[PDB]
Amino acid sequence: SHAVKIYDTCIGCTLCVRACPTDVLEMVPATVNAAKQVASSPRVEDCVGCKRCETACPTDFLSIRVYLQENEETQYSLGLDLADWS
Amino acid sequence: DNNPLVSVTQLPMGGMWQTVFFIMCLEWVSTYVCPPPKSKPWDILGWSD
Amino acid sequence: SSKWVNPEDPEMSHPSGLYVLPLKPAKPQENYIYTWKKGEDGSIEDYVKTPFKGPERAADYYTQRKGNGAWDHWGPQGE
Amino acid sequence: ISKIAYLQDVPRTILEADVLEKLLMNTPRDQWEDPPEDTYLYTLKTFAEVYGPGKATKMGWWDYFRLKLDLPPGFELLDEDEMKVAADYDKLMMEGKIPFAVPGPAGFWYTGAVIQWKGKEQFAGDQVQTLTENGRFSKQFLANLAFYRDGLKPWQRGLEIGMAHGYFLIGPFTSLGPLRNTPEAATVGLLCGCAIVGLVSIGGLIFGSTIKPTRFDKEGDKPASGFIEMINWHAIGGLGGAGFAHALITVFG
Amino acid sequence: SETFRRRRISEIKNGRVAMIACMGYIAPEYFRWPGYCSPSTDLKFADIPNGIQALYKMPAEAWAQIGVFIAFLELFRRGLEAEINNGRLAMVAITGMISQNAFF
Ligand code: CLA
Ligand code: KC2
Ligand code: KC2
Ligand SMILES: CC1=C(/C=C/C(C)=C/C=C/C(C)=C/C=C/C=C(C)/C=C/C=C(C)/C=C/C2=C(C)CCCC2(C)C)C(C)(C)CCC1
Ligand SMILES: CC1=C(/C=C/C(C)=C/C=C/C(C)=C/C=C/C=C(C)/C=C/C=C(C)/C=C/C2=C(C)CCCC2(C)C)C(C)(C)CCC1
Numbered sequence A: 001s002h003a004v005k006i007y008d009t010c011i012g013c014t015l016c017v018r019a020c021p022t023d024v025l026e027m028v029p030a031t032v033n034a035a036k037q038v039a040s041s042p043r044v045e046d047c048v049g050c051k052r053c054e055t056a057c058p059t060d061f062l063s064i065r066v067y068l069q070e071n072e073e074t075q076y077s078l079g080l081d082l083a084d085w086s
Numbered sequence B: 001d002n003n004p005l006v007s008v009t010q011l012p013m014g015g016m017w018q019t020v021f022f023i024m025c026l027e028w029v030s031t032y033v034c035p036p037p038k039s040k041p042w043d044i045l046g047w048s049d
Numbered sequence C: 001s002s003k004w005v006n007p008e009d010p011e012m013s014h015p016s017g018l019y020v021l022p023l024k025p026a027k028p029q030e031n032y033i034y035t036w037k038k039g040e041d042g043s044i045e046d047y048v049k050t051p052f053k054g055p056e057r058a059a060d061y062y063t064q065r066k067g068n069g070a071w072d073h074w075g076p077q078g079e
Numbered sequence D: 001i002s003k004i005a006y007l008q009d010v011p012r013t014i015l016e017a018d019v020l021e022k023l024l025m026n027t028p029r030d031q032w033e034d035p036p037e038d039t040y041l042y043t044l045k046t047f048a049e050v051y052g053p054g055k056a057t058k059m060g061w062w063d064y065f066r067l068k069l070d071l072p073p074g075f076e077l078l079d080e081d082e083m084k085v086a087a088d089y090d091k092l093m094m095e096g097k098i099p100f101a102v103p104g105p106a107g108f109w110y111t112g113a114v115i116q117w118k119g120k121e122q123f124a125g126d127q128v129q130t131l132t133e134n135g136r137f138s139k140q141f142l143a144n145l146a147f148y149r150d151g152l153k154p155w156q157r158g159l160e161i162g163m164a165h166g167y168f169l170i171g172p173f174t175s176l177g178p179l180r181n182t183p184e185a186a187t188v189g190l191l192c193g194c195a196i197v198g199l200v201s202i203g204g205l206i207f208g209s210t211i212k213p214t215r216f217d218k219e220g221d222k223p224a225s226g227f228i229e230m231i232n233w234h235a236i237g238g239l240g241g242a243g244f245a246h247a248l249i250t251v252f253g
Numbered sequence E: 001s002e003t004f005r006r007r008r009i010s011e012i013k014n015g016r017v018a019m020i021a022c023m024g025y026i027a028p029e030y031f032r033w034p035g036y037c038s039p040s041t042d043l044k045f046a047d048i049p050n051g052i053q054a055l056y057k058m059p060a061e062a063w064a065q066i067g068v069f070i071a072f073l074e075l076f077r078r079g080l081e082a083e084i085n086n087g088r089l090a091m092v093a094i095t096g097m098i099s100q101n102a103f104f
């Protein structure tokens, strides 16, 4: 699976969460920024690696980073449809 | 010869028996391996499923 | 507020990232395969789900998979 | 309808009564109140609110010309039968039934048949019905193939399949091989066919050793034992069929 | 069991075909049908030989037509005890005769 990390530069605009195609991310309460919320990545097992969160991130450099891990590819991260590894 | 009845005789026995055997195999498959339903005996291709 | 408890590291959250524990069925579905079922009156069905005693393919690769998670890494709560 | 102000006593010049009836029938009922901007009914509403009895009774020649240009004629709108046919088509497709057609030259013909496109599992794309695979004849044929036939031992399945495979395999080498013109063409082709049978049987043994299918296995038996038995007997049957074909060729020239 | 039943059917059949083959080996020497077996090639029964030589002699077309007829036939209790016993005897006789013809 890929690694989706969030950094404190986050401003809690929720655009990453809204752009998530498989609902990997969710906003959580925080005090670091004025919006009082920061995106989290609890369901990183479903991350496919499309980097749409990264596309939608406003900050100067991304407060959300998706690191691709081709060696640890799973069926959920590969979006397998015709074949099942479960 | 263009006349089909003459062409039958002009054809080799090899081809004639091959044709007869192929039609026999088709009939066997259609009547024993994949028999049509008793309600629609003419439904060879099984459309009524 | 997540009911899931991480098996490897209790301090961390569960890898699943879910908040509601799974619901077990009344009777788990048994292994099956889609085959024909001759109707005994000349009929025949195409995709009939019929029981299969064991794994359809007994390869170690196939049988090692339990479906608990991506790597079967979810705790007992996954089942 | 009477409740619509602009549809009341529309002058014949702006739009004929029959064409107006056809346009209303074609248009959805809910759109009569306030039709979308890009519709004939919208044009008719806009111009009937301005022209007609109790309003401007004259128009410039060019304005009237443009109005008649952009209003619809009778033959442009669909007929009752055409609308019924389209509605039936859409209803069939949404219900999951397909008015059967086969592609032809740069098109497709309608065979006049309605089939059940959706299978038992509605959301399963594997189960969509087709005559090729889900017809009675196809079901019976596939079920009666050696791989599938009921009441057959794995050795019987493999033997029959291999007989067929070797018997047809010897021929290509015999007829089109490098030594096709030599007196040993048939024997060399038999050797090549037996080699091909052996290679495919070795591949099948690899398949049964790696994936280990267990559909042919007896109860309480080692996994893939039935499949391996079937593959070994396929090798035997291929040898036998290749030899039989070679013998027939040699004996009958 | 299924194997015993299949083997019984196979034995009965091999016995019938063996009686038939023994009769077809015995009869031709005594007498042969007339009437130009293959008039196209000017072939006659007196000319055709009896035994394994017939396979080469008479045309592949004729052999294929015989095979097609057999294919049609196949595709479309003291008496039984005598049948099976005679089947055994005829199988022994036909295998012996064919082996002798091939060897010598
Ligand atoms: C695809 C193109 C093609 C074709 C048609 C041929 C054809 C031929 N090559 Mg080959 N050849 C090719 C590409 C091709 N070559 C290429 C790319 C190379 C360079 C690597 C060579 C190099 C080469 C050499 C060096 C030689 C040949 C030779 C031959 C001949 C014998 C081959 C043989 O033994 O086949 C064996 C055939 C089979 C095992 C059977 C496979 C095909 C069957 C018929 C498929 C049937 C499918 C069936 C319809 C499915 C029905 C299913 C269901 C509905 C029932 C033959 C004329 C030999 C020769 O002497 O030629 C005169 C020879 O020495 N070829
Ligand atoms: C009715 C359907 C039919 C089918 C399903 C079918 C299938 C096959 C197959 C595949 C299973 C093969 C491999 C095959 C091979 C040959 N066929 Mg054949 N064939 C059919 C029909 C005819 C007719 C009408 C003739 C004929 C012939 C030949 C010749 C020529 C040899 C030569 O001329 O030396 C060869 C090699 C001609 C013939 O026998 O000529 C003496 C001939 O007239 N076939 N044929
Ligand atoms: C017992 C099975 C059997 C059946 C059921 C059967 C049926 C029919 C039918 C029925 C629809 C017709 C119309 C027909 C026609 C011809 N048959 Mg045939 N026939 C059978 C057996 C043999 C044998 C053993 C030979 C043979 C032949 C010929 C010749 C060519 C003669 C020639 O050579 O001039 C022709 C025209 C000979 C042959 O092919 O010779 C090269 C040959 O030896 N047949 N045969
Ligand atoms: C049912 C059946 C069947 C079956 C079959 C099968 C199932 C098969 C398969 C088979 C297989 C499954 C095969 C395989 C093959 C293989 C191959 C072809 C391989 C190759 C390889 C490679 C190419 C590799 C390479 C390498 C090396 C060695 C080292 C390192 C590097 C590399 C990677 C390069 C048959 C027909 C018999 C008969 C009838 C019955
Ligand atoms: C679709 C189509 C088609 C197709 C066809 C086909 C595909 C066919 C096939 C064919 C084939 C593919 C055949 C085969 C056959 C085979 C055989 C006939 C075999 C036999 C064998 C034997 C007899 C053996 C024996 C043995 C053994 C097993 C072992 C030991 C030794 C011995 C020798 C005893 C056609 C063209 C018609 C046309 C129309 C359409």
Ligand code: SF4
Residues within 6 Å of the ligand: A006, A009, A010, A011, A012, A013, A014, A015, A016, A017, A038, A039, A056, A057, A058, A059, A063, A064
């Ligand atoms: S990851 Fe980017 S888009 Fe999402 S809350 Fe943080 S700054 Fe906003």
Ligand code: SF4
Residues within 6 Å of the ligand: A004, A019, A020, A021, A022, A023, A024, A025, A046, A047, A048, A049, A050, A051, A052, A053, A054, A066
């Ligand atoms: S890469 Fe795509 S799937 Fe993964 S967290 Fe980002 S938006 Fe979601």
